[PDB]
């Protein structure tokens, strides 16, 4: 049921393809990571400490 | 037979100055023969052999003897199937043991025993001088010489020339992969005509196309679904092999490359074999990977390591070394007759491979690359 | 067009803080960015394409766009034609400049310019991160990275992920070879249909089986011998090639391998060039050997090394420039239109490849492998 | 008319094998080297510091 993320993209995505995103919180997990969901339903893990990461999620919050 | 793989424990304890050796023949001491001729020397006079006794692991293949009538030399060459990656530039050197020998003939040659051992690399070929020599004998010669790890691998061609063709003649080529392991590449002498008759040694690369783990997209088709807990197994042992059945498991490689949310897994079996209740050699299954402490970001250091695990049977019962560094750990599957290579998941990302070697059989696991 | 070899001087006196670049951006000096990236920012805000005047040659390719509608991320791809060897795990470290850029778009953009970078080898994937950067603009980035230099060499696969298909745009590898020689690798964006149309950049293998040159058995089948003066050339150039015409000799094959005495040679020509006369940029001629020094035969230190000479022209005559290291010469051949290769016999032995880079054309010698 | 040797063979010849054996001497020669004439009529270059190349050479004098 819970899934985790082992590897950051390092590579950014289009704000404009990115739906919601939420954080990894699970205890069951072991990297602390931001999970981007897509437009077409799909997640991917990204990195915190990356300044897109960050500033796409300025875009994601300020919209809602 | 002319080629195989064999396995035995390796204690230092009870080998002859076994601790002198390992400290500056088999590591890279000193820059000169002296130290190590002069162990030797004390040693191999008392007990010729006693050098066999440091390999954990032996891996021979038979060569044809290859003749040069014009110079009258009786030539064996042959790539060593090589456990594991070597290293990395930003590795240091090992100091490997090269050892040359045969039958002593009953009847007195016309001339002295003599062989010239050489490595040969796509760039430079080492070969070992008598500047190398560390021992000497009527029927056997030893070297040593250091050599950057990274150059230690797939490629690097083995070359001996005598004068004749020595009964039992053989060339050996000891490579210390980590203070405690010791693998012994070597080659036998056969027959001008006879085929060459390697051993039963396989390199696999588990994630051909690491592209294609680089989301969870094919997960479902390749079978790699908590449900399954992660496991698509494939065997590694061919119909003839021996009496152990070895398989490995290709989904570590998700863990390995994927940036799409995976199943939290407890650990991942890399591989497991079968068949431990009736063999009675150890088995050791040494991992390749690098460290964990991130570097540098414009400077990544690129430093390779090895630790070797061993599962040896104590009375009748299997068990395994450890090591709180060590990756990856060994651990008795349903039974006592089935081993298992597991890993913690987060682990994967640095780990470049893992071979398992036992009684007749070698596999060198690779998560990196296409060959 | 969308490729090509060019080359052109590289004077440091009048290239604003040229060498404070050189030596903190293109020296592998202080492990981070701030050094380098407080010298661009004086610079390059100056003159944003300053550093253009550093490639002593640059040689493009045209790489299809290649788009990733899910992300929408469009990514240009490439292998980068390397014109040496890139060293040894011996040798030390290169620190390589990476420019991502495109052109300015007359009409403001939905989003900022954006580009990610990565240099990925069998092993490790170098990818320049945030910490590498050492210079941004609207349509610019820099990015500066350590790299092993055995790593730097083909098997280096580039890839570059923009957001767009940026016009213009384009990715820059500058590395540099040797203190005064820096060469630079891109890669232009062309339509995702078109083909690949890659630089008239060849590599060639001199002395495939070096086993052959092992004597002189073959020297008179070959052509080379102290009548034809050890002279057996091969055009290099093709025919649709460029008004020049590049060539290279494989006798010297025998001076590296052979162990039968050959004649003596006051020198040997590696290669030479017709065309000068209708040439316009200079011509680099670039060398990968070791050493001379002897080492110990216990540790055989393999540290390659890399010398360029430069022919131009001044004033309508050609000249060359020299070095009392490098084993090669450049000297005017029959004419004015003739320019050869030149080396003493003696330093054969120790030659690992020669690369020569005009106008239009570069090829890759080496003295080594078979591929 | 001069030859010279540029690479020695560090592979020891049978001296049941080894017709001659003749010195460099020529100025024109960069190597000091010990050139091996075989029974074959073919001559091979050898290193003087290595002692198969001078105990090669004891016999091929004490045998004349």
Known sequence: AVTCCYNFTNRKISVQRLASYRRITSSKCPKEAVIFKTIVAKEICADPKQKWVQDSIDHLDKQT | ?371
């Open chain 2, 1 to 371: 037979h002319s080629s195989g793989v064999s396995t035995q424990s390796v204690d230092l304890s009870q080998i002859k100055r076994g601790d002198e050796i390992q400290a500056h023949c088999l590591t890279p001491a000193e820059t000169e023969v002296t130290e190590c001729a002069g162990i030797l020397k004390d040693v191999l006079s008392k007990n010729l052999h006693e050098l066999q006794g440091l390999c954990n692991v032996k891996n021979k293949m038979g060569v044809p003897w290859v003749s040069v009538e014009e110079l009258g030399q009786e030539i064996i060459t042959g790539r060593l199937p090589f456990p594991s990656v070597g290293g990395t530039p930003v590795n240091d050197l090992v100091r490997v043991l090269v050892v040359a020998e045969s039958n002593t003939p009953e009847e007195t040659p016309e001339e002295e025993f003599y062989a010239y051992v050489e490595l040969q690399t796509e760039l430079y070929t080492f070969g070992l001088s008598d500047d190398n020599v560390v021992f000497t004998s009527d029927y056997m010669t030893v070297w040593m010489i250091d050599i950057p790890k990274s150059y230690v691998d797939v490629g690097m061609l083995t070359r001996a020339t005598f004068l004749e063709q020595w009964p039992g003649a053989k060339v050996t080529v000891m490579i210390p992969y980590s203070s405690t392991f010791t693998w012994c590449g070597e080659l036998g002498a056969i027959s001008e005509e006879s085929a060459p008759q390697p051993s039963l040694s396989a390199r696999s690369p588990v994630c051909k196309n690491s592209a294609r783990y680089s989301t969870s997209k094919f997960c479902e088709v390749d079978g790699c679904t908590a449900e399954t807990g992660m496991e698509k197994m494939s065997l590694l042992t061919p119909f003839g092999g021996p009496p152990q059945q070895a398989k490995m498991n290709t989904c570590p490689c998700y863990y390995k490359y994927s940036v799409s949310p995976l199943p939290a897994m407890d650990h991942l079996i890399l591989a497991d074999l079968a068949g431990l209740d009736s063999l009675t050699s150890p088995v050791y299954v040494m991992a390749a990977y690098f460290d964990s402490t991130h570097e540098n970001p414009v400077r990544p250091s690129s430093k390779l390591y090895h630790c070797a695990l061993q599962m040896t049977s104590h009375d009748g019962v299997w068990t395994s070394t450890s090591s709180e560094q060590c990756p990856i750990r060994l651990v008795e599957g349903q039974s006592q007759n089935v081993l298992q290579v597991r890993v913690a998941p987060t682990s994967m990302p640095n780990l470049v491979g893992v071979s398992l070697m036992l009684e007749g059989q070698q596999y060198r696991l690779e998560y990196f690359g296409d060959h």
